[PDB]
Design a protein around this ligand. Sequence first.
Ligand code: HEM
Length: 152
Amino acid sequence: GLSDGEWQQVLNVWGKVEADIAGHGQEVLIRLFTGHPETLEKFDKFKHLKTEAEMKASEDLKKHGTVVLTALGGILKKKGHHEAELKPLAQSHATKHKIPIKYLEFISDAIIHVLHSKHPGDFGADAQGAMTKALELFRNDIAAKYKELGFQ
Ligand code: HEM
């Protein structure tokens, strides 16, 4: 649950992402894959990537980064009223991709890391607080659907 002022911070930060969605999406996935190499094994189309240089050179990884952040941005713009947008993603990630909630924690922290890396000194403590709360809400509502499905 976020206040109006917190949502305003989230959507202000998101403007930074929308200026370069592919570059942000690429770096988020690279941070996930290099920090948590077990996550790469869930992607049949990226498991061939052995080095970060190959990851950086992969145009399909940048494409998928655009898909991921476009979906997340659509959810964030609903300011919590995201049941219709979130349900299909919860279902596909639990039942088809088999993504444990832990990996959603990993990618949430990766987003925070990338924002500081690309905007050092321009991602203030209030903005980090609000973005963190928004990603916690996203993860918590996914977790509720995971529990319904019995997925661990
Ligand atoms: C912010 C969190 C995430 C968002 C918004 C997101 C979004 C998406 C979307 C929109 C798709 C394509 C449609 C679909 O299959 O539902 C997708 C596919 C997929 N996601 Fe995610 N995802 C997220 C996190 C993760 C994480 C953490 C993992 C694994 C560590 C993951 C694994 C996958 C896989 C394996 C696919 C299929 C890729 C393919 O072969 O095309 N997702 N995701």
